[PDB]
Amino acid sequence: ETLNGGITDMLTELANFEKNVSQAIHKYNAYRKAASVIAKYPHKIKSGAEAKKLPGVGTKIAEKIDEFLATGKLRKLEKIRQDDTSSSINFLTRVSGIGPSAARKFVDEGIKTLEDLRKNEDKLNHHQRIGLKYFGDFEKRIPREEMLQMQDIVLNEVKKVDSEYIATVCGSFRRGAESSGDMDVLLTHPSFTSESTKQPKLLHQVVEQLQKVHFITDTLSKGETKFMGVCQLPSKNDEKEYPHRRIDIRLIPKDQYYCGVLYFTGSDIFNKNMRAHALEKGFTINEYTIRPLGVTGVAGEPLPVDSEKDIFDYIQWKYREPKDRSE
DNA sequence: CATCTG
DNA sequence: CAGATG
Ligand code: NA
Ligand code: NA
Ligand SMILES: [Zn+2]
Ligand SMILES: [Zn+2]
Numbered sequence: 063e064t065l066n067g068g069i070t071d072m073l074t075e076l077a078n079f080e081k082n083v084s085q086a087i088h089k090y091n092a093y094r095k096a097a098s099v100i101a102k103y104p105h106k107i108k109s110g111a112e113a114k115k116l117p118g119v120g121t122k123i124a125e126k127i128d129e130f131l132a133t134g135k136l137r138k139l140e141k142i143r144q145d146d147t148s149s150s151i152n153f154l155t156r157v158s159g160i161g162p163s164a165a166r167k168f169v170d171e172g173i174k175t176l177e178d179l180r181k182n183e184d185k186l187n188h189h190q191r192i193g194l195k196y197f198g199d200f201e202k203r204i205p206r207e208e209m210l211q212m213q214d215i216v217l218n219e220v221k222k223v224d225s226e227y228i229a230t231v232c233g234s235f236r237r238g239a240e241s242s243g244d245m246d247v248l249l250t251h252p253s254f255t256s257e258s259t260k261q262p263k264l265l266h267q268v269v270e271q272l273q274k275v276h277f278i279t280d281t282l283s284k285g286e287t288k289f290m291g292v293c294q295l296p297s298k299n300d301e302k303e304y305p306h307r308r309i310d311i312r313l314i315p316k317d318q319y320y321c322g323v324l325y326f327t328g329s330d331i332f333n334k335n336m337r338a339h340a341l342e343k344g345f346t347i348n349e350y351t352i353r354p355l356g357v358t359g360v361a362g363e364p365l366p367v368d369s370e371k372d373i374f375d376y377i378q379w380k381y382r383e384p385k386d387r388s389e
Numbered sequence: 390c391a392t393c394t395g
Numbered sequence: 396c397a398g399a400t401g
Contacts, residue, residue, distance in 0.1 A: 158400090158401080159400070159401085160400085161399060161400050161401085162399095163398080163399060163400085164399075164400085189400080189401090282401090283400090283401085290401075310401095
């Protein structure tokens with residue numbers, strides 16, 4: 063956690079670049095298990111060979127550790143931080159809609175910067191476009207003070223459209239958090255469930271309403287269950303307009319809402335621990351359900367949940383306020 | 390994983 | 396449809 067930090071960090075840089083710049087997934091994948099194991103390792107790595115000793119650690123990685131250990135740096139790492147081509151792919155990727163794949167193409171094309179991007183607004187697709195238009199805004203964190211306003215509006219409008227709508231803003235925003243990055247709404251409706259064959263409208267009506275009143279600004283991707291958008295808090299009395307904010311809404315069958323709710327609220331760490339315990343207790347839990355673990359190895363069947371309460375209870379746990387859902 | 394693109 | 400993004 064700090065004894066083998068830089069090692070695990072360099073390893074991380076290495077893995078990353080393998081993937082993003084070159085295409086070396088195996089390689090990339092290599093740096094990763096390595097950094098994981100070294101990460102878990104209880105002693106101070108004092109040398110290459112010492113490490114090598116570990117699983118995942120081989121020759122080439124050891125090689126590197128040595129150098130890194132021997133001196134405060136790593137040539138390759140140093141060469142990678144200069145190389146503009148590398149650098150670009152890191153940058154270009156910054157744009158919502160621009161993954162690595164794409165980052166490579168543009169670069170081979172010459173588009174390396176934001177301007178490059180503007181001038182070439184043709185080569186970009188819709189998402190990529192919005193991405194570009196809201197670059198700065200996109201990167202701005204969302205202070206909860208705005209989160210509440212948002213949340214305010216969202217829930218009021220969802221309500222108007224149908225009283226049976228159950229919406230919930232998960233995320234860290236849900237776990238206390240002073241600021242978030244994006245806004246994720248979990249949505250279900252009584253008339254939506256596991257068997258119940260579809261009902262697209264269920265998600266479309268609200269989307270509409272949102273944009274009706276202007277909270278939703280653009281559409282990123284909009285399917286039958288997931289909608290990816292842009293939204294914004296109505297600029298008050300002109301002088302201070304809001305930034306554009308990422309937002310996602312998703313329809314879930316009412317019969318697997320809280321698992322998800324729980325699920326989405328996190329943290330990952332809370333999840334695990336709960337997941338592990340769930341297992342002791344003789345159960346299993348995932349994004350959508352909780353199930354009684356048979357003995358034959360495994361086994362299924364959905365347990366019937368009506369709140370995050372029903373879940374814990376099951377695992378015979380202490381109900382945890384979302385704030386203390388941390389770890 | 391669900392959506393888009395081409 | 397395979398492949399990309401989030
Ligand atoms: Na991107
Ligand atoms: Na293939
Ligand atoms: Zn030791
Ligand atoms: Zn989100």
